[PDB]
Point group: C5
Chain length 202, copies 5
């Protein structure tokens, strides 16, 4: 198989609408935010404008191929792949995807989608101008798939990719996993809560 | 049937353009707004900028499948489904859908669609910076289907509903009420149903 | 015929690019604007931001069906229909369509399309703060079809106007016009909508 | 042939991606701007926001039909036609097309496309508040087709009386430019808009 | 072959999703930016709004045709072609493409794509209103393809810095330099190439 054959096969047979659950197990989705920039902060409105790497990982075995004498990875448009229906619960603008919308697919069926995203959020901006800084929390989870269909899990220097030219600096980033039941649905929905501790530079 | 078969079948036979009236009855559409945020308010122009979840429910039997030994629910892109043509009459921007545009479909044909939407409305902002607050009314109904084709009703509430509102808003919600109306417009002979959602809110002090 | 059959037929024989003229007569298009709101007015720049329902009506016999024992109306996506190529000549933004883009089609072939639209126009804003108000004129006609192909005609002044606007409507009138531009031999029809409005006391 | 047949034929055979050269002669494209409005002018940044009709004309013989007993013109979506790949070199926003994107096609293959466009340009705004006014130049040509493939040539009265500005004069010049990156000449039309603020 | 045949063939067989690697070797992609305008600069936020021609060049042999008695070049919509998945790492808006999205394809398979782009970047704006000027650095590379799949060539030949630069900008260009970098990201284990373009500019002030 060359890349042309692999991509032809994926295009003809991937079902982008079909969640790739195996044996009534959930699809395990890894989520991790790498902050690139903090562009605007409003301590009165409690709004922030940030740019982050949304590093997203999952397995889809229907994509797998024998790579014994073949490329073991290809890049694939996400329009030809199933992708998890993740959303930030406290976002107040839609995600502005800054980068080409291609995922990397490994021959064992591992998919890695890592777009750079600019988005506005409602969160706690108090303390942004102090030693301890502000802590803005961002919840991301599957919009329509409960915990028996999609599980989300944090994977893991916090400023590695953070712009040195921002007016802000990152003090710390922590992630944590949540299982929430909402009074109107019987099942639990998982999210990752990302806490960004940052402050205005001096 | 596995999920792949169910979604294949739906994709091949949905008929997204066809309102699923059963016999000669209206499609019963449930609608309810859960407010997530109030972002901007202007008392001189009587405009508000708001984020809400638009909880929407209806039945489409053409989607039903035998779930005896199968998944009883799947997620489906709304582009593959008939969806009610709802609109807010006093909206002054088009809905900005913040979330993935997927509905949940149950094996008995029940459809649940709930996008998170940011939108601007024209409404009564007077009193917002007082203790009794302002009362903004949002009117939602089918744009082109009269009452014999689509009926709209509020869903019954959850104890949780008041708690999706952001604690970080400059504003706080005092109360949310809903009400069903049937209006006849001068341009058209039949009645059109809407739900009016009254949002009583004020600036935090 | 049920609705599924009607909509299948419309979709399958869908000729959205083909103007439905009958017998070498023009397609008669009705248009009227129902003003919903006036959001922003600038008397220095002579610009207004408005919300209106664009009530549009025409006949397309290729859509017709025998409704003797069938629904006599269906809702149809305008993407599956021919639609007159109307434009406001003094618009300075593209139309922002606020509603689902569905038209109502009657079994005799009549089509009724009435979207809510937000749009900005260049027009006379002088006198908006006076008692007689300003009069803003909105010119609407077919962009590319002359009078032998499309004719345009008019279809309560504030039955739908928002009570929460900073403005009030004093009067709305419509005149028809037929214009031969220096660019083309044929005449093009338009409707002129005059909106007389003022800032509330 | 009725309109339905003509439009069916065009939709099936028009090759929107294929430049309609005949006998290795350039496609002759006429372009002219009719100014409708000047909305915003910035003396700080040297930017102007203007609305114009972009009157564009060319011949595509593959569209032609026998019109002896048929309509001699139809309106056609530009998505079904080859369109010259014109761009304004000093534009700083993409063209906002205000009107239905339909062209008029004549039975001999002549195409006439004239959208109303709102667009923002970088140009000389100095003098906008004097009697002599400012002169803003807009340069338009084919982005990727040189002079042996596309030639461009020139083809007040529609200007809004409600603009804060008035037009003193519009002139049009044609140029043939060779750029560093490329061996062939590219043609453009330069439109000079002499305008001023009304007092 | 006439143009119609060449374009038909390209439309029928180009695999837009398939990177045109020969063997195990990378597709060499050339990238250079020609600055057209600097529209807005914010020294407090360290943000700039710029317009440039993003001259992009690569080879795709699957597009090649015998041009002995045929046109040796055609213009082709990029939607019918594989194009490299380049992104500016410090962009804070998506690219606003100002021009028709057509690439020029030569009969040997060389592709030349040169759109005019307006985009906002986060970078060092300090010194913009001084004589020595600011230096804003723009980083562009393949988003998902490592160095064995795409190499980015920043090299230049006979370029001048202000040739296409607008005389009506509030800013002037002092110098433009290009440089290649190779980085290993903590996400993955391979090297990824980028071009770093350094724009030395200042506010006009004489
Ligand atoms: C059963 C009933 C409703 C939904 C459903 C559809 N569409 C959005 C949601 N959401 C609420 C659950 C938690 N995630 C936020 C969105 C749920 C799914 C399964
Ligand atoms: C017959 C029945 C309805 C319509 C129709 C189409 N398109 C918008 C409307 N509207 C008035 C009804 C209430 N909803 C607001 C808009 C009506 C046309 C013909
Ligand atoms: C405080 C009080 C109410 C709400 C609130 C927001 N958003 C929807 C509701 N609901 C309950 C009332 C019944 N109708 C709609 C659902 C309540 C938030 C904070
Ligand atoms: C929008 C607003 C709130 C939440 C939200 C997230 N995470 C936990 C909660 N809550 C915990 C108890 C369950 N009911 C609602 C309150 C709410 C999500 C989206
Ligand atoms: C022959 C007849 C009409 C047109 C034509 C194309 N495209 C815009 C127009 N317009 C002038 C007519 C009335 N509407 C304004 C724009 C005309 C072209 C060739
Ligand atoms: C060979 C010849 C021309 C181009 C080409 C592609 N794409 C934009 C240009 N431009 C410069 C020429 C004049 N038009 C401005 C843009 C040239 C590529 C390869
Ligand atoms: C294997 C190889 C590459 C990726 C991959 C996917 N998606 C974005 C990246 N990035 C890091 C490489 C340099 N460009 C920034 C984005 C890498 C995933 C698995």
């Amino acid at each position: 198989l060359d890349r042309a054959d692999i991509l032809y096969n994926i295009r003809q047979t991937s079902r982008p609408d079909v969640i790739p659950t195996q044996r009534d197990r959930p699809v395990a989705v890894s989520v991790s935010l790498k902050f690139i920039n903090i562009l605007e902060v409003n301590e009165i409105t409690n709004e922030v404008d940030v740019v982050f790497w949304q590093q997203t990982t999952w397995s889809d075995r229907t994509l797998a191929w024998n790579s014994s004498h073949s490329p073991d990875q290809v890049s694939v448009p996400i329009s030809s792949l199933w992708v998890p229906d993740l959303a930030a619960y406290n976002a107040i603008s839609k995600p502005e995807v800054l980068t080409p919308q291609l995922a990397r697919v490994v021959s064992d069926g591992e998919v890695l989608y890592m777009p750079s995203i600019r988005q506005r959020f409602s969160c706690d901006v108090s303390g942004v101008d102090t030693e301890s800084g502000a802590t803005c929390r961002i919840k991301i989870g599957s919009w329509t798939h409960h915990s028996r269909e999609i599980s989300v899990d944090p994977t893991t220097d916090d400023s590695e990719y953070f712009s040195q030219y921002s007016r802000f600096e990152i003090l710390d980033v922590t992630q944590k996993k949540n299982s929430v039941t909402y009074s109107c649905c019987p099942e639990a929905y998982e999210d990752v809560e990302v806490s960004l501790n940052f402050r205005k530079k001096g």
